[PDB]
Model the fold of this input.
Amino acid sequence: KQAFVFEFDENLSSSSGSIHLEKVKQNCSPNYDYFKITFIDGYLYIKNKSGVILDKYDLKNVISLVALKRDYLSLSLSNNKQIKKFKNIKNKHLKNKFNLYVINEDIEKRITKNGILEEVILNKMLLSILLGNEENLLQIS
Amino acid sequence: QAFVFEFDENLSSSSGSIHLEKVKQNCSPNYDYFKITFIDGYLYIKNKSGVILDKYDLKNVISLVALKRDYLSLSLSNNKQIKKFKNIKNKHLKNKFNLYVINEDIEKRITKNGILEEVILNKMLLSILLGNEENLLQIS
Amino acid sequence: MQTTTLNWDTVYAVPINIVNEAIKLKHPTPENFELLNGKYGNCSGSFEEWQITNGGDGSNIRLKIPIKNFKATIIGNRLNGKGGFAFANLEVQVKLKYLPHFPQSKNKDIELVDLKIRTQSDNPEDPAIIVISSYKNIQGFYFEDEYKLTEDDEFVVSYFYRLIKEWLEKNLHFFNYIFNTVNLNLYISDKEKWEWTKPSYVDYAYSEIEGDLSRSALGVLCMTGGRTGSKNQQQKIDPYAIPAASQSGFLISEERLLRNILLPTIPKKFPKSKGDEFEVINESSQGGGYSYILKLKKGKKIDLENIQAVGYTCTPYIQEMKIYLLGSYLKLETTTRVDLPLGVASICETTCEYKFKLSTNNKGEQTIAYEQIGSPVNIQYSENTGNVGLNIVVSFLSATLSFALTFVPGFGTFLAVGLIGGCLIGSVALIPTFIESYNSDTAPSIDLSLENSVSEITWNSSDVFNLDYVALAGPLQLGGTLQVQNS
Amino acid sequence: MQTTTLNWDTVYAVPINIVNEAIKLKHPTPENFELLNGKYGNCSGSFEEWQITNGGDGSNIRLKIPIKNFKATIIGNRLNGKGGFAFANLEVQVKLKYLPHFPQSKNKDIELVDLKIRTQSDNPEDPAIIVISSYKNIQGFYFEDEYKLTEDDEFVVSYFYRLIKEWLEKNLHFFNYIFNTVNLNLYISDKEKWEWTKPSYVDYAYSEIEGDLSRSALGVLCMTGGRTGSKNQQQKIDPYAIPAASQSGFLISEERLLRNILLPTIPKKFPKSKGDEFEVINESSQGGGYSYILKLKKGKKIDLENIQAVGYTCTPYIQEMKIYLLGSYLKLETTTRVDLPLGVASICETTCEYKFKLSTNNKGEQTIAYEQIGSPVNIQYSENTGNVGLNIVVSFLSATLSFALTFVPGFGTFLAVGLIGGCLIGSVALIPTFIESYNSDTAPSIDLSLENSVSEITWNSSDVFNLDYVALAGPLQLGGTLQVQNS
Done:
């Protein structure tokens, strides 16, 4: 598949939509793979403690750049059973096995022009939909 | 796990579905044996009047055939990806792989009725199989 | 050309043309037949003798049955009429079967069995007589008002054929013929000579090459020495079982040559051996088929006669060896190693090759001879770990080369003569004496050997096998002509 | 352990601990900081010394930035309030950059470049500063939220770090530590010595292995001799670059040793030859990316000095050879062939091995010595198309064996001493004279070659490389300790 569903839920923000992923050719970090994430459609919601929507940001066409250690390539097994999502488990922090990090959450600053708040939340969202789902990256060219 | 067959001839007709399977054997190492089981269908014996002189239910008839393993060279390239066992009406085709019938009706569900039934069934089996041996390539 | 027994112990292959000839000769007279009061109709006609024709495989045999002056009356609610033909070939498929031969042999140790057409079967999935839809060269066909043979009435002929089958099924003598007769040795034990060529289990195979009957063969397949058949065995003949030079062929599995002749013999070449160092195994890459080798067990070595080199009494040893059958050769590879205590290691990998052939002794009797092909091929690996002086190193390696170049051909000769010995005298225990006194001029006749091998199977009641070829082509391979009695 | 330069010419690997220790000694980290009048908030605090920490790779460097006595005001419509922490360890990711050194070199043939943190970037896909999402050892966190904070203090902390990042964006230059300094020899030509060790292009790499930091290194990677970088070069250091025995490691590519020292030198061993018969290629086994070997070009042979052999004057020749670097060794394999006019050919495949080590001459000066490891290992075989008798063949093979055992070590000795020659004197033209008159007691000091190789790179402004180790481990490998000028 080209596009993937993503879902993110936490107490003060949530997001969903679909993303396109592609490997980024690079020669500066031989032990890491770079991936470019393009948001095809989606919204980022900021909510209060009781779930009321305070703000929302259209993610459409936002572009993110991430990297992780090529240890993930040894993940088994790339089998189709069945539909892969980039989903997080609400309030369940996970281990970062492959030193996944975000290089730039919004390259063209479509949302982070709004300020640090958006950057920080977008950064958190990216790590949270990726971590634990790295086996999904195996099929990305 | 099924295939549709269509057999059309001047004095004899047949339609339905069959289930084929490879028969393990250790007596003819250059040949593959197949067990054909008729899931559904009827065998029509007709005159030139084209009416129904006799109608036999092919249900559960079991047939056994063999052919030269050379057929395994065949390249299927499923196109158009739907495969039936259909004879080409009134056009006797070649037997590339020395295909032959070992038993037309093992339990004699139909052939108990005499020699004519053996003859017709034997002719029918060769007709639906010949030309269509490429279908066999996917039968375990 | 290298051939194989395909996991059988012995294989006896004869061209189909030769078999059909004996059949025709023994049944020259046509036979009138008639079927009256048949449920599905009646018929009458004349047979000529059946013949094996192409299209068979393994157990399955095609027969061509020529029929002339045929008439039939068909009965049924559905079809009904009188007809016939002037000539047609009925083609059927049958199997053959080994059956006890009568009278029984006087020797209660042997069961004579005959190869004959299997006339009856109680298994619905394996009919005794299968009619093949072949409307070849039918002449003078007619049925009621129709005197032409059309596609629309070809089924009438199929009906005729099954009326003829009805007669055949009730008149089994039509199929009488003894293809061959085999001495099954029921109770084989160690005490018998040539145990490896005496059949204890037998089956057959029809093998056709390119659909050409003239290049096709019927084969007798035997397990010997008390072995019986298994899933390991197939009803198949190698294309090259029969020598190009000869009419008919007989093969003895190189497995049996190696396991039963050389393996028990080889320790007698080595006085310093303990006797348990050697084995015969099936070698291969990824999966194993028919390639056998006589070798040392893993971890084993053989000490040899001591040599004197550069002032030292040294003990050569064999750390590795391979004896096997490839193409026309018995091949020997032997790795010999010698260490000089000062710190020089010598390792020679030496290879020798042997052909076998038909020959004669002083008495003009047929026998088996061998010859070494070319000179030993040697590769010498050396190491100097004591930083020994040049002259000593060079002299030492020269001595150990000299040793290998004489010892290894000696070992090769032992094996070749030993192999011939087992073949000719049949008693393994007698082979070391045979080697010691071997002489081309003096070598015993192969006749006793044949009596216990090929002649364990008799074709066409009384055919004699006339040997005209012997070679190694993987298995030991015999070529000869079947002589029919009463010339 | 065999190592590799991974297609670079020269490699200089220093443990990260040494680099960090140097930073804490020079205290380049700014003390107090404050962001005033920011749109999204403001902050202030104190830094403790910045240090390289784990998680980087190649270009990418992770810095631990410990912060204390921190407070910040957050300004926003949603998140808004004042807070701080007593201590935190901020982790960022940055890159380093080579910049023109000042004051420049007077020699305009040499361009001095400094390795320093990259402070800015105009490529959005390559931020100068990346904040890492790590919240380690945060003490005394506090924040007064005017509305919402169900998600933890982690969120506020991430916001704080971005405020600190805003200050960093404008103040990273405050951290002007020079990691190392490199002399770029632009314009290398004519009679230049040691051209294969004079850098013409330089880059760097962080390398970590699990077990971290203690075993992690910062590497200076150079292309030399006018060569430049390419996609062929990766920012990576082999795990075995630094001798286990030493603090820091310097590597000179085996490819350069072969192309620039031995390849021009080896013809001078055979004034018989034309001089165009040799080549350095990429084909050898097994691990890594690829290995380099010096061999005869296809089709070529090298006539050697004549020998007497069983009454005939024969010319041995080199039919094939391989010079290559394996484990701890310079290895030479030479295949010599001799053809006897009687029609027999001798073939010897002879392998010799040489180690290098740090040594001293009689003036107590450090130098490079060598030694042959054991004796030649040999393989000998033959071809006999003339049907020549065994006795002649054996005597013939003795003579050719003796020649190989004498010639090939002499060949290896020439190569070993030739290579020391090139390393120690840096001029190809002078090597033959060096070989001819070599003497380990009198061999020149390595100091001049160090000036032109390793000391072309200067760490921590004024470090001096104290050599304590030399070996061949694929590429020439130097082991040593950085001496920090006490001051």
Helices of chain A lie at 116-130.
